[PDB]
Amino acid sequence: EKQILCVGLVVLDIINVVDKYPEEDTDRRCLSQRWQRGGNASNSCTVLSLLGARCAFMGSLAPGHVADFLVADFRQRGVDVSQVTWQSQGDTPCSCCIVNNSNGSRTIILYDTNLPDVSAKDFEKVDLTRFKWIHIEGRNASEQVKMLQRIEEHNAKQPLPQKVRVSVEIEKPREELFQLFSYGEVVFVSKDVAKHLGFQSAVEALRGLYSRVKKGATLVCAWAEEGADALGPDGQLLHSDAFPPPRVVDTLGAGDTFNASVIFSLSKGNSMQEALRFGCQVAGKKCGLQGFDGIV
Amino acid sequence: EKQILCVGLVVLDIINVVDKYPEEDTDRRCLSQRWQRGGNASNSCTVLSLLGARCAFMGSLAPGHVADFLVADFRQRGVDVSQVTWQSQGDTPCSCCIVNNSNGSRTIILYDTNLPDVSAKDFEKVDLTRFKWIHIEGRNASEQVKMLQRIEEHNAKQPLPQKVRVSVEIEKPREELFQLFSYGEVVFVSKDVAKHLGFQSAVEALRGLYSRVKKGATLVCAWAEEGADALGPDGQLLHSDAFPPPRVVDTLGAGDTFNASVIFSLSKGNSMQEALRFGCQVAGKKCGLQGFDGIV
Numbered sequence: 285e286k287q288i289l290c291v292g293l294v295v296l297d298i299i300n301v302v303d304k305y306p307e308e309d310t311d312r313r314c315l316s317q318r319w320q321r322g323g324n325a326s327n328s329c330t331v332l333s334l335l336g337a338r339c340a341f342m343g344s345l346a347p348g349h350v351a352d353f354l355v356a357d358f359r360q361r362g363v364d365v366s367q368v369t370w371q372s373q374g375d376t377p378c379s380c381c382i383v384n385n386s387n388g389s390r391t392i393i394l395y396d397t398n399l400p401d402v403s404a405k406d407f408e409k410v411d412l413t414r415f416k417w418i419h420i421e422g423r424n425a426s427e428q429v430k431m432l433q434r435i436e437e438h439n440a441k442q443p444l445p446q447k448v449r450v451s452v453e454i455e456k457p458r459e460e461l462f463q464l465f466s467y468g469e470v471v472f473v474s475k476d477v478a479k480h481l482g483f484q485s486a487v488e489a490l491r492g493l494y495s496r497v498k499k500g501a502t503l504v505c506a507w508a509e510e511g512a513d514a515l516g517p518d519g520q521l522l523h524s525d526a527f528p529p530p531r532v533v534d535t536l537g538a539g540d541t542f543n544a545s546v547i548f549s550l551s552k553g554n555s556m557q558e559a560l561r562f563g564c565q566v567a568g569k570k571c572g573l574q575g576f577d578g579i580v
Numbered sequence: 581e582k583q584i585l586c587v588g589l590v591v592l593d594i595i596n597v598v599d600k601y602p603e604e605d606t607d608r609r610c611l612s613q614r615w616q617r618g619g620n621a622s623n624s625c626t627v628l629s630l631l632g633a634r635c636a637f638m639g640s641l642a643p644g645h646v647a648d649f650l651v652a653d654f655r656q657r658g659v660d661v662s663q664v665t666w667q668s669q670g671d672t673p674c675s676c677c678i679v680n681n682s683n684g685s686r687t688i689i690l691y692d693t694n695l696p697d698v699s700a701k702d703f704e705k706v707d708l709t710r711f712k713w714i715h716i717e718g719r720n721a722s723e724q725v726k727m728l729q730r731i732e733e734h735n736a737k738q739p740l741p742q743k744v745r746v747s748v749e750i751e752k753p754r755e756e757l758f759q760l761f762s763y764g765e766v767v768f769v770s771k772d773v774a775k776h777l778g779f780q781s782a783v784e785a786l787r788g789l790y791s792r793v794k795k796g797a798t799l800v801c802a803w804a805e806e807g808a809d810a811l812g813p814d815g816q817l818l819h820s821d822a823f824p825p826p827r828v829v830d831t832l833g834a835g836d837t838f839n840a841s842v843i844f845s846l847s848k849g850n851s852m853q854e855a856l857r858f859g860c861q862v863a864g865k866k867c868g869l870q871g872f873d874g875i876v
């Protein structure tokens with residue numbers, strides 16, 4: 285009955301599949317175009333739902349056609365959005381994406397602004413006993429640090445079988461987000477963050493960044509087509525190769541698929557080695573199809 | 581009380597204003613992004629409305645969030661959409677547009693498909709006495725030829741002050757569309773069509789293509805920043821220079837603005853020379869602002 289909660293961003297992705305990258309100053313038909321619910325935390329809710337886990341999303345929405353599409357899509361997947369922060373006004377962000385079918389490239393034109401992120405005041409109203417796992421996409425670090433501290437104070441009063449497991453994603457190389465390294469039992473660190481901090485390989489990143497994580501936590505670093513690596517308190521450097529499809533056609537959300545699949549596998553009691561393998565398997569399969577529905 | 585009717589395409593334009601053309605395989609914020617009702621005939625209704633003429637739109641829509649946005653926008657402008665053909669199913673087309681603020685470039689990723697165009701059976705239900713002018717965007721020529729013939733049969737029974745004036749646009753270089761040359765009192769021919777038919781200047785295009793238009797009609801050929809030219813039955817080659825803004829920032833719909841402004845000026849009894857001038861003035865002003873609302 286307990287759900288998995290993901291806190292972070294939801295956007296509307298308008299995805300244009302093309303057979304060649306558009307030439308500036310021209311008009312040309314795409315191969316296909318679709319509206320797709322996006323955002324890191326939102327995409328991980330999609331994959332968790334497809335994998336069979338009841339999950340909830342916490343993010344910001346503003347009234348309009350965009351939010352109406354997103355709410356209906358959330359409902360279709362069975363993702364709980366009762367804790368979404370509804371802003372009085374604003375523009376729900378929309379990403380225009382160009383997916384080149386010929387070379388597998390992914391180009392994202394991101395919205396110029398975002399709605400205000402979920403506040404710690406917002407998060408304080410959440411009944412934490414509803415959830416066995418809470419994943420936070422690193423965005424507004426000062427507010428999210430307070431959220432993570434609230435979960436720690438909650439867990440201090442709970443016995444072992446009723447503690448809420450926590451994971452965080454640190455994807456953008458913004459110094460403020462690095463306060464999140466010291467929270468959660470699993471920390472997903474992006475390749476962009478690793479390179480920004482001076483590491484040019486997943487193995488180097490784990491060795492160099494492990495001192496930042498909380499006592500007993502596991503650091504996870506996915507490295508695109510090179511697979512994914514992890515380092516936990518037992519001191520073993522773990523690695524899974526990627527599972528590339530015969531033809532890479534859609535990598536948008538592949539990292540979100542990896543994140544959700546690792547969470548799913550760990551929530552079912554699997555080892556980090558198996559969860560890393562499972563995450564690359566599901567994410568690699570996703571890269572060979574459009575959207576997420578085909579991962580099954 | 582009589583309105584102007586434009587028959588053709590409506591699409592949803594998602595317009596991304598950027599400071600540099602997006603690099604393939606990257607993510608980057610735009611300067612701004614907006615939803616804008618688009619399509620040639622639909623854009624001309626917008627400009628006609630802003631210029632103060634009551635107008636109506638005839639096109640195809642299908643249920644969904646896209647049509648809901650478009651219908652509300654039509655309503656905001658006061659454009660009558662009672663004769664829109666509502667399809668039972670389908671995807672209302674959406675164009676993803678990249679507008680480079682630095683060089684004024686316009687890149688359009690067009691939807692892969694379109695809804696079925698308005699049929700001659702659809703158009704037969706329209707009360708032609710409602711309209712003093714009917715403009716047809718050349719799309720499904722075999723059906724639109726029947727529409728134009730119906731207007732001719734209607735006008736044959738009307739006295740001089742009650743005849744419906746007709747204009748056509750021939751924008752795409754598709755051979756089937758060239759059946760429309762012989763219909764209407766004003767024929768807008770695009771630069772792309774002129775070059776496809778072997779003419780590299782507006783003046784050459786008018787001289788070489790005038791034999792195709794109906795007896796007494798005027799052929800109009802706009803040539804982007806070179807202005808616009810026209811040739812009517814008096815035999816005088818007319819030309820207006822363009823009226824470029826201090827900085828060209830948004831040319832999407834500039835041709836639709838020119839078309840509507842020429843129609844507007846002619847409907848108010850002005851000469852072709854003045855209507856050509858007026859069309860370049862309004863379209864040139866449009867090129868210096870986003871969307872159409874600022875033309876005033």
Ligand SMILES: Nc1ncnc2c1ncn2[C@@H]1O[C@H](COP(=O)(O)OP(=O)(O)O)[C@@H](O)[C@H]1O
Binds near residue numbers: 512526537564
């Ligand atoms: N091009 C690719 N080919 C095969 N697998 C991939 C590819 N990109 C990503 N993956 C899979 O997805 C995971 C996450 O990659 P990441 O680099 O974080 O994705 P994103 O591009 O979404 O940020 C990898 O660990 C791998 O399992």
Ligand SMILES: Nc1ncnc2c1ncn2[C@@H]1O[C@H](COP(=O)(O)OP(=O)(O)O)[C@@H](O)[C@H]1O
Binds near residue numbers: 771
């Ligand atoms: N780059 C530009 N600078 C100035 N005026 C322009 C420009 N592009 C178009 N116009 C104006 O708009 C009119 C129509 O141009 P056209 O080439 O048909 O537009 P479109 O690019 O929308 O097809 C021109 O006759 C001119 O009045």
Ligand SMILES: OC[C@H]1O[C@](O)(CO)[C@@H](O)[C@@H]1O
Binds near residue numbers: 324537540
């Ligand atoms: O940065 C936000 C972008 O990233 C994604 O979440 C994919 O991971 C897209 O759905 C969204 O447009």
Ligand SMILES: OC[C@H]1O[C@](O)(CO)[C@@H](O)[C@@H]1O
Binds near residue numbers: 617688832835
């Ligand atoms: O071809 C259709 C495209 O052209 C426009 O009508 C501009 O003239 C756009 O609004 C639409 O996306």
